[PDB]
Design an enzyme around this catalytic site. Structure first.
Site, short mmCIF file in Angstrom:
data_model
loop_
_atom_site.label_atom_id
_atom_site.label_comp_id
_atom_site.label_asym_id
_atom_site.label_seq_id
_atom_site.Cartn_x
_atom_site.Cartn_y
_atom_site.Cartn_z
N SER A 26 1.28 -1.00 0.02
CA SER A 26 0.30 0.06 0.45
C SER A 26 0.89 1.66 -0.13
O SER A 26 1.73 1.50 0.83
CB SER A 26 -1.31 -0.29 1.59
OG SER A 26 -1.96 -1.09 1.06
N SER A 104 2.02 -6.99 1.34
CA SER A 104 1.13 -6.99 1.97
C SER A 104 -0.15 -6.81 1.37
O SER A 104 -0.70 -7.92 0.79
CB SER A 104 1.68 -5.13 2.48
OG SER A 104 0.57 -4.52 3.75
N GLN A 105 -1.21 -5.29 1.21
CA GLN A 105 -1.86 -5.95 0.10
C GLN A 105 -1.29 -6.43 -0.91
O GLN A 105 -2.74 -7.45 -1.93
CB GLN A 105 -2.57 -3.75 -0.10
CG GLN A 105 -3.59 -4.15 -1.83
CD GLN A 105 -4.25 -3.06 -2.01
OE1 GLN A 105 -5.14 -3.11 -2.20
NE2 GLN A 105 -4.14 -2.19 -0.86
N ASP A 159 4.29 -9.46 13.09
CA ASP A 159 3.62 -7.68 12.34
C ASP A 159 1.91 -8.52 12.64
O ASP A 159 1.28 -9.71 12.18
CB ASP A 159 4.08 -8.56 11.01
CG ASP A 159 3.45 -8.03 10.04
OD1 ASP A 159 2.70 -7.13 10.14
OD2 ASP A 159 4.47 -8.06 8.54
N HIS A 172 5.90 -4.86 9.93
CA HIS A 172 5.41 -5.20 8.96
C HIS A 172 6.16 -4.29 8.21
O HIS A 172 6.05 -4.17 6.51
CB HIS A 172 4.10 -4.71 8.59
CG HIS A 172 3.41 -4.48 7.64
ND1 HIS A 172 2.88 -5.63 6.61
CD2 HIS A 172 2.44 -3.35 7.27
CE1 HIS A 172 2.84 -5.75 5.83
NE2 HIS A 172 1.89 -4.29 5.68
#
EC number: 3.1.1.74
Length: 197
Positions: A26, A104-105, A159, A172
């Site tokens: 992101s 992540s995303q 995370d 993260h």
């Protein structure tokens, strides 16, 4: 650097043997973000610049933070974009071995895309790496319809997104070492397992 469009720019008459498709996290820049360039450098070292095409997921994938909260952890438009890239790879270079990854995303996007992919194309992805996998707990560390032996998840202790939450804590943002070593090591190994060398 942060933008690589090797597949889109690639001449079918001279297909690379390995095609890597990667989705950034992101708010990250270009189509590779913070981790992709590191992975790319190591792949190029192993297969040579002309031996591997590096392709980030750009276009409709905006890597919008809020989309982490949508059902699949990303938008329908983003999934459509990544599916289109796998389809382009299969069309332009049917004999190339594919590899993929996401952060992540982008890891949720990679998982959703692979799950929806025509099996004949999905079966060509020799290995996939996911960092800070937002659907880690929900999918029990797997990508639906894809083998566990071809999957490697990097989820740091602390995370929170790997533990069912959407809170972003310091761990993260600590996947740098993984992207520099074990992640490309896994991808190279999985490609050589099927292509030999």
């Amino acid at each position: 650097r942060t933008t690589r469009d090797d597949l889109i720019n690639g001449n079918s008459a001279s297909c690379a043997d390995v095609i890597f498709i990667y989705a950034r996290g992101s708010t990250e820049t270009g189509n590779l973000g913070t981790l992709g360039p590191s992975i790319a450098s190591n792949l190029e070292s192993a297969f040579g610049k002309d031996g591997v095409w590096i392709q980030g997921v750009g276009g409709a994938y905006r890597a919008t933070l809020g989309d982490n909260a949508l059902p699949r952890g990303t938008s329908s438009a983003a999934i459509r974009e990544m599916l289109g890239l796998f389809q382009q790879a299969n069309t332009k270079c049917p004999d190339a071995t594919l590899i993929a990854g996401g952060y992540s995303q982008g890891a949720a996007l990679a998982a959703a895309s692979i799950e929806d992919l025509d099996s004949a194309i999905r079966d060509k992805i020799a290995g996939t790496v996911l960092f800070g996998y937002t659907k880690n707990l929900q999918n029990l560390g797997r990508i639906p319809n894809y083998p566990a032996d071809r999957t490697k998840v990097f989820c740091n202790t602390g995370d929170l997104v790997c533990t069912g939450s959407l809170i972003v804590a310091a761990p993260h943002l600590a996947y740098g070492p993984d992207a520099r070593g074990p992640a490309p090591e896994f991808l190279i190994e999985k490609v050589r397992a099927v292509r030999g060398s």
